[PDB]
């Protein structure tokens, strides 16, 4: 009946049962860091590969890292951002909003439908990975999509509502879901405990690559700072020819839950962006953008970025944006005060700083110090080169992008 019950029923079938399906799971990073708490341990006290082993012991045929999906979201959203910027430089509006939090998307559709054109058309990391698994991977393995089950483990009590949006399906059959069942961190922790699985005592297991070949999770060593930051990095590095360091956002005075940064961008010498800048000098009235120039004509643009945590705080930001008192070009809205590490499906703690501990243990110090870039991932490159085409192209649009419905679904 429940989605947990349905997923477990699929896993309960012997692997040689004629009605057995190919049961896949993907795991969010916020789940990996918090799952140890379900055993009464500290965040990060169990390793990612111990979790992978635990999931394989439940019977999953494939065990994926949602970060693979996030590399797709970075490719698409980075390209989408650069495209909106390019169109506006040469005279899909700006500012652009992120779209990965279903709590934001619900409030958008119900209370701010006039803002729909400003929102990124990207699906979330979990939905992009799911779309890929029941298209590319199904084909590769010679499995009918109807014989694939996709399960995600999320820190979030809203991700099932995201997965359930009707058109997230295979070949216009709304009963053939791209993503079937979402299980929360605590629900998974309970499943393990009910079965006498102690993650902390497991050997290291292995991840599967959603490409269906090669070792590991199909994601390179290192960190990105998350999809919004890496989308900015994608756009910035193409625009300027220079690397964007890890961002450090600053709190906004007088606005709760809002952080910001400004990113100055000079176009690369000889680039189209350099040409556009010189040669061509709604509800959210754009202000034409923030620009600067120098005496010799080396002009640039300043990208103004905001992150809102908490939907109440986001409502106050939107009011100020509509008034023209807050001026931003790219805005992320997340429903949870602490973001996904503090999601509604996470363990409950008496520790007032538990989300800080989760954030700190989210990735190890070795990887924290190393910046990775999604477009350099050979698995991602191969997927675009041999299957998807170009970011924002027809196939990528079909599988990886979405739309919004005024009034909600
Ligand atoms: S911020 Fe909260 S509601 Fe939004 S995706 Fe993350 S866990 Fe879910
Ligand atoms: Cl996601
Ligand atoms: Na593997």
Residue numbers in the entry: 65 to 155, 161 to 350, 363 to 490
Provide the authors' own sentences about this structure as they appear in the paper.
[FeFe]-hydrogenases represent one of natures’ most effective classes of redox enzymes catalyzing the reversible reduction of protons to dihydrogen (H2) at turnover frequencies of up to 9000 s-11–3. With their low catalytic over-potential, [FeFe]-hydrogenases represent excellent models for a regenerative and likewise economically feasible H2 production. Their active center (“H-cluster”) can be structured into a standard [4Fe-4S]-cluster ([4Fe]H) and a diiron site ([2Fe]H). Theoretical studies suggest that the most probable PT pathway comprises of strictly conserved residues E282, S319, E279, and C299 (from surface to H-cluster, numbering corresponds to CpI), including two protein-bound water molecules (Wat826, Wat1120 4XDC19, chain B) located between E279 and C29915,16,20. In this study, site-directed mutagenesis (SDM) is used to investigate the PT pathway of two [FeFe]-hydrogenases, namely CpI and HydA1, which represent the largest (M3) and smallest (M1) type of monomeric [FeFe]-hydrogenases, respectively.
Crystallization of HydA1 exclusively succeeded for apo-protein, which carries the [4Fe]H-cluster but lacks the [2Fe]H-site. Variants of HydA1 apo-protein were crystallized in space group P32 2 1, with a single chain in the asymmetric unit. However, comparisons of crystal structures of CpI apo- and holo-protein with apo-HydA1 demonstrated that a lack of cofactor does not affect the configuration of the putative PT pathway. In the corresponding HydA1-variant E141Q, the glutamine residue precisely adopts the conformation of the glutamic acid residue in HydA1 wild type. While glutamine occupies the entire space of the native carboxyl group and thus clearly interrupts the putative PT pathway, an exchange to alanine may support additional H2O molecules to bridge the gap.
